[PDB]
Design a protein around this ligand. Structure first.
Ligand SMILES: Cc1cc2nc3c(=O)[nH]c(=O)nc-3n(C[C@H](O)[C@H](O)[C@H](O)COP(=O)(O)OP(=O)(O)OC[C@H]3O[C@@H](n4cnc5c(N)ncnc54)[C@H](O)[C@H]3O)c2cc1C
Ligand SMILES: Cc1cc2nc3c(=O)[nH]c(=O)nc-3n(C[C@H](O)[C@H](O)[C@H](O)COP(=O)(O)OP(=O)(O)OC[C@H]3O[C@@H](n4cnc5c(N)ncnc54)[C@H](O)[C@H]3O)c2cc1C
Ligand SMILES: NC(=O)c1ccc[n+]([C@H]2O[C@@H](COP(=O)([O-])OP(=O)(O)OC[C@H]3O[C@@H](n4cnc5c(N)ncnc54)[C@H](OP(=O)(O)O)[C@@H]3O)[C@H](O)[C@H]2O)c1
Ligand SMILES: NC(=O)c1ccc[n+]([C@H]2O[C@@H](COP(=O)([O-])OP(=O)(O)OC[C@H]3O[C@@H](n4cnc5c(N)ncnc54)[C@H](OP(=O)(O)O)[C@@H]3O)[C@H](O)[C@H]2O)c1
Lengths: 486, 487
């Protein structure tokens, strides 16, 4: 028997879920380790992990702020008069408010530890000495002071992921989203590099808060942003992004970043194009944060990219060490890590083997306008099924007639297995699609068919009723081939 | 002859237009649609597109969108937006002008549809029946007016909608109803909405945003609490949030006499003996089936005591070739329910695809500020129909509103279930976006979802809708009709 039942390394969405359920629902001695207790430099994350501190929660408060540049512009069309020249955004006030809010969640979690018997927080760098001994050192350097040594039954690794760096000359003058949450002034000219959702979301933020002559550029090495998402939506989002002032640059990737005399960055693009920017933000990928846990010391196998390898039940190759969340590089989303933490406590401390279903998980992109997506994209479904039907509706929501932002089309598209009518993926662009898609993913867990959609009576006037208005396929794929008739 | 027309539709509203257009376009019949007017406005208000396009859903939602801006411009200050907050002014004439050109564009679209659907024709005037195979198109509602046309038809479809109800009181002619509210040339300073339904609570939101600076909007309603028929908790939260935004909710209040002051404004004396004075007194206390000028006795069609045309599952009347759909039948009064009914009618009769419209678990949204999204049964009803009811409840302030300053804005979702098998019987939400969330929840409820279907879906974060998936434990129960607590 050991001093601790469970030692969780990482106090994030996964680790906090597993830690609280094991101590509370199962009366275990759980020790949770994290570097920091309040959000901020030097480690950015703290209690609550990347979601609370430098992820979902601060980013969404900041996208809600970014949104008012649009709604103040659009109130003109509904008769709201005001001195439009006085309208100035204020970055410092936004950052102060954000900071205020995340500090509350940090304090919420000291309360959780202080009120759960068996749950204790232990601040520092956790590293493995063998599969029953976790060390808490002062810093990642394996020659720093060990602050305490914990003897334990099971170990759960929930260390998350870290921004990926480009190895170009000048990478150290670029920032990543961690530092974007702590900037002092909003950049007048900014470069976001990557076409994934963290890039697009931050481009929407910077675009709203820049000084009046400013410009935001989004650079992407590929052909069209947001690879892996539905093509048509990717095409449509690129236009609304450009219609709000962003210079989307595809097939573009930086080569050298140099600091200019004033402190701005001089980028030389792989194309030979050059430009100067107040801030260059690297949002090119999040890599699994496993590289300093001394996993080698306990025999845990990691992947090429550093992902800790785990089976369906999150077990590694060492029988009492499990790993969950982003470090396992399965679907990197907060709900998915929370699920995995709950399954693990059932598997290990309740002996109810549970496995997280990583399929049909729905996700949103909080761009302006937003996206809400779930299940297959037609190219994939087309590969796995002989007859796929694709449905799509597109319309400007009426308020946008009167508002002036006529470039804002709501778009909804549905991919089905044409044989049985089962819905395989629903993809949406427009406001409120993050909210609409949550209820759509429930339908998709239950095996909804397309007649289940169009036999439901609509709620009018709403965009979401278009989901129940599509009864005829726009086109098909018969045996991998796009086709118009079957 | 043969019979000159296949179907004559009286009423070019939601269900009428659905039927007339599907029957001619898809089944090639010769269809005559009758309406009083081609473009919105006085004197009839409703025109092509009916009540919803001209004086109902579409104008009301645009004016609700405008009304919202009072709160979004207020709330931007918490997120660092700086502006001359003194200079903010609503301008009602600009709202009505924009609204009016958005509605007239839709009237032009319908016009084009008659122009290019071969077989479909608009006929204009008052439609009345002569016998079950002859519709008269008269000059006006008067049974004596000149009859401009006589249509010899096989089928008659009655899709005439409903109309505002009036109080019997002295002064009733000084009050307006929602038809005129869409046409006010000046937003009222002080205004009273009487009624506790969705139209009333909706116009209190609109007048409250556009009033001049010291204005007041009062909503009077004779019951104990507004929006009878909805979730009890949600009616308490909506009343407090209405109040928190400046609307004075006077319950157990009903006008007794309205009189005109010298200055123009109206003086209302409540039955309580309370009295006040207002620019506008709007009455939103009920909608009557509009069937009285039709001469249904000539064809022998039976109507309910409130004017509702009595119909069966297939919308057929007691006269076999006459059918009725939409609000004139008084089943569920909503545009999507009339549309479904219209399409089911053309399948049954012309496509030999018999379809009764299902009127259970129809979702509906109340576009108040904040809005509500509702589908299925309220717990007090479920408790009378099932021996074991569990209520799951969750309410939270979006952290958005900690920063925004509107801390009164609680989001709330309440789920009612049959506790034996855990099927979800009703989902009821209050809060922003709830009308977009409930549509997709109505699909789950028609499939027969159980609450394990909800809490085993992985959430999308950060959203309000993800509370639907984070409810695992019942708050209290109803065992054999009594609110129990451990079951
Ligand atoms: C900018 C951005 C936006 C995002 N937005 C969304 C969104 O809106 N929705 C969504 O669902 N997902 C979003 N994500 C992702 C989401 O934050 C992650 O999926 C999720 O937090 C990962 O969960 P986790 O349990 O693996 O731990 P994480 O939440 O990353 O937590 C990891 C924890 O381990 C700690 N740590 C690291 N190594 C050690 C060590 N040796 N000792 C001790 N502690 C250590 C980190 O300090 C710590 O906080 C976003 C991510 C980013 C970066
Ligand atoms: C203020 C308001 C807001 C509403 N908001 C919503 C909402 O957001 N969502 C929703 O689902 N529902 C809403 N409704 C209800 C919805 O508008 C109606 O349920 C729907 O339009 C009814 O469809 P209908 O086919 O019965 O006829 P209607 O659309 O009312 O059409 C009736 C048609 O018949 C014509 N007519 C009547 N008598 C004759 C005659 N003798 N000859 C010729 N023509 C005649 C009327 O002029 C004509 O427009 C609202 C209604 C109002 C009043
Ligand atoms: N919508 C969702 O919520 C969702 C979606 C997907 C993933 N995830 C998850 O995955 C994480 C990382 O997100 P991310 O936004 O950083 O996106 P990611 O999609 O890998 O973003 C990388 C982007 O940069 C490009 N890129 C990658 N490596 C590059 C390189 N070396 N040089 C140049 N460009 C390069 C990629 O182009 P290519 O696309 O051509 O590689 C892609 O456009 C999230 O934190 C995690 O939550 C969530
Ligand atoms: N949420 C929705 O979308 C919703 C809800 C229900 C129905 N509907 C649909 O069906 C309809 C009828 O619903 P409604 O809400 O308008 O119905 P209603 O109850 O007739 O609405 C009238 C409102 O005024 C009150 N009232 C009625 N007669 C009164 C009188 N003579 N004296 C004083 N006040 C009186 C009613 O109170 P009491 O309740 O005390 O009578 C209620 O508060 C609508 O036309 C229709 O579009 C929609």
């Amino acid at each position: 028997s050991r001093a601790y039942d469970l030692v969780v390394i990482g106090a994030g969405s996964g680790g906090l879920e597993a830690g609280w359920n094991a101590a509370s629902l199962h009366k275990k001695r759980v020790a949770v380790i994290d570097l920091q207790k309040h959000h901020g430099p030097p480690h950015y994350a703290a209690l609550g992990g990347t979601c609370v501190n430098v992820g979902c929660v601060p980013k969404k408060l900041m996208v809600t702020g970014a949104n008012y540049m649009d709604t103040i512009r659009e109130s003109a069309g509904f008769g709201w008069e005001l001195d439009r020249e006085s309208v100035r955004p204020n970055w410092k006030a936004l950052i102060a408010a954000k900071n205020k809010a995340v500090s509350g969640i940090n304090d919420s979690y000291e309360g959780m530890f202080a009120d759960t018997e068996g749950l204790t927080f232990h601040q520092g760098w956790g590293a493995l000495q063998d599969n029953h001994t976790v060390l808490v050192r002062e810093s990642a350097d394996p020659n720093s002071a060990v602050l305490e040594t914990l003897d334990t039954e099971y170990i759960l690794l929930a260390t998350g992921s870290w921004p990926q760096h480009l190895g170009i000359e000048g990478d150290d003058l670029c920032i990543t989203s961690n530092e974007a949450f702590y900037l002092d002034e909003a950049p007048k000219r900014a470069l976001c590099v990557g076409g994934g959702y963290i890039s697009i979301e931050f481009a929407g933020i910077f675009n709203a808060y820049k000084a009046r002559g400013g410009q935001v550029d989004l650079a992407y090495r590929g052909d069209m942003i947001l690879r892996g998402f539905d093509s048509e939506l990717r095409k449509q989002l690129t236009e609304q992004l450009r219609a709000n002032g962003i210079n989307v640059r595809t097939h573009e990737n930086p080569a050298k970043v140099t600091k200019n005399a004033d402190g701005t960055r001089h980028v030389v693009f792989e194309s030979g194009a050059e430009a100067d920017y107040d801030v260059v933000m690297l949002a090119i990928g999040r890599v699994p944060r496993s590289q300093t846990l001394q996993l080698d010391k306990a025999g845990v196998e990691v992947a090429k990219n550093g992902a800790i390898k785990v089976d369906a039940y999150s077990k590694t190759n060492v029988d009492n060490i499990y790993a969950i969340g982003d470090v396992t590089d399965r679907v990197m989303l907060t709900p998915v890590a929370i699920n995995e933490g709950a399954a693990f406590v059932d598997t290990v401390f309740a002996n109810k083997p549970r496995a997280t279903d990583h399929t049909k998980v729905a996700c949103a992109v909080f761009s302006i306008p937003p996206m809400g997506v779930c299940g297959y994209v037609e190219e994939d479904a087309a590969k796995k099924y002989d007859q796929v039907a694709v449905y799509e509706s597109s319309f400007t929501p009426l308020m946008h007639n009167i508002s002036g932002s006529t470039y804002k089309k709501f778009m909804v598209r549905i991919v089905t297995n044409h044989a049985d009518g089962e819905v395989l993926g629903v993809h949406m662009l427009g406001d409120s699609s993050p909210e609409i898609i949550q209820s759509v993913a429930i339908c998709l867990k239950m095996g909804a068919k397309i007649s289940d959609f169009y036999n439901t009576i609509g709620v009018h006037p709403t965009s979401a009723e278009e989901l129940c208005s599509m009864r005829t396929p726009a086109y098909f794929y018969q045996k991998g081939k796009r086709v118009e008739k079957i």
